[PDB]
Amino acid sequence: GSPPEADPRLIESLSQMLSMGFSDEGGWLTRLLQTKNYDIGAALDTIQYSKH
Domain total in the chain: 1
CA distance 24 to 28: 6
CA distances to 5, 12, 25, 42 from 15, rounded to whole Å, are: 11, 6, 15, 14
Ordered DSSP codes for 2-47: --SSS-HHIIIIIHHHHTTT---SSS-HHHHHHHTTS-HHHHHHHH
User: Length of the chain in residues, anyone?
Assistant: 52
CATH of the domain at 32: 1.10.8.10
Experimental determination approach used:
NMR
Containing domain of residue 17, as a range? 1-52
Residue 29 near residue 43 (C-beta atoms within 8 A): yes
Nearest residue to 48 via CA among 34, 38, 35, 28 = 28
Contacts of 40 (CB under 8 A, 6+ apart): 13, 16, 17, 20, 33
